[PDB]
Amino acid sequence: QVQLKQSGPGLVQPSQSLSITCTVSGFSLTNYGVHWVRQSPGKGLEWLGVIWSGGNTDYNTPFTSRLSINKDNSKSQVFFKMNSLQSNDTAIYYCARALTYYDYEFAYWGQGTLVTVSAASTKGPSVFPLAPSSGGTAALGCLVKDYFPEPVTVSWNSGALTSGVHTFPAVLQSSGLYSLSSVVTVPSSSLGTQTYICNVNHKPSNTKVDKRVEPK
Amino acid sequence: DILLTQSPVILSVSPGERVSFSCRASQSIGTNIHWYQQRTNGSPRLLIKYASESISGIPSRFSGSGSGTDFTLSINSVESEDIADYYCQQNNNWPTTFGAGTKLELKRTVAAPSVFIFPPSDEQLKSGTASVVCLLNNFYPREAKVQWKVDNALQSGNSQESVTEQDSKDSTYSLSSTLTLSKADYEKHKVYACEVTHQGLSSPVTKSFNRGA
Amino acid sequence: GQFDLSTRRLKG
């Protein structure tokens, strides 16, 4: 089916340039245009521009000078580049495809790329167990602490465990580093037969950790 | 640019009820408006195009109407899974623009939280910092009070809270409260207590541990 | 009423 998959999230320094690659499948860049939209705290959903089937580009007015979109049809890749970022350019950026080749009803979206504009340094998280110690239901979790920038992904048992999972929104500590926890409730009777692992991946630091969580 | 004003900012209803979203344009845009849904960590999902036309894969409870300046997205009978943000988009005039979104919240019966407390791992203590976590699981409504006490001393300013969005199946919230101490401080004390106040509890619930056991 | 980068949800 139609898909768009973007490159990973991460850090851009103040005044530097932003690069994202959108790889598509299930259709050909020669028959469809690819649009770029961002979503930011101060401006919400914002349309940035488009590259059309035959190579032409349109850019929304406040971006005509710092934005460039190119592509490689044979590799099914679209290249987004934007210059001189300031902190209010921090946003989630999406590539998107319309239903019809010429139009703007956006039926297909990339998964998004969170871009943080900051002078600070990348830092991977430490992962600490929230160990189970109530109606035969026990609660356990992982503490994902002191990373930057957002985001981090958490899952349980390589995707096989989803039921009863709560992954909390990250909160920013006074240190400027983020933290979050991910919890899950399971039958206490399975603590002796099942293994519980939180798979943690912090892409901007290429820190990727599996943490086994056991009663202590 | 066309300015799109969506109203109200938040909508709250119960499952099975009907709900409508308003999107008003600063000048006529014909029927050239599209609607989108957005869930937690998701990309926008196209719901309706050209004010009223169906989208493949979109449940039939979603419809839209309007023309000129005044547009309406409607859900005739709300499902718990409709918890999301909703946006409109115009494309009668270049460049295409979006409205600021309406939040959809669901009402349900009161559910008291299940409360759990987690001491800091011996692993974390090696770094010189202690995190104590208190979990309030699957409650409604959102409003909850978490009070931290260390050896009967009220803790203030050294905890942070995080709340999930409403669950797409049971419409509850879960909340984590994290108390952060220096390791030196954590070792100087013994009794660590999280006390939870909530509409669904007939009196506050305390979960505590003694450092060590 | 503000988009939150953490959650991708509107918040105030």
Author numbering:
A (entry chain B): 1 to 133, 138 to 220
B (entry chain A): 1 to 213
C (entry chain E): 1 to 12
Reported in the publication:
Recently, we identified a cyclic, 12-amino-acid peptide that binds in a cavity formed by all four IgG domains of the cetuximab Fab. Owing to the location of the binding site within the Fab, we have termed the peptide a meditope (medi-, middle, + -tope, place). Based on our observations, the peptide–Fab interaction does not affect antigen binding.
As arginine side chains carry a positive charge at physiological pH, we tested the effect of substitution of the arginines with noncharged amino acids on binding to cetuximab Fab. Finally, it was observed that substitution of Arg8 and Arg9 by citrulline dramatically reduced the overall affinity, presumably owing to lost electrostatic interactions. Thus, the charge from the guanidinium groups plays an important role in the overall affinity. Attempts to reduce the charge of the residues in positions 8 and 9 resulted in weaker affinity. Interestingly, the change had a larger effect on Arg8 than Arg9, despite the fact that Arg9 forms a salt bridge with Asp85 of the cetuximab light chain.
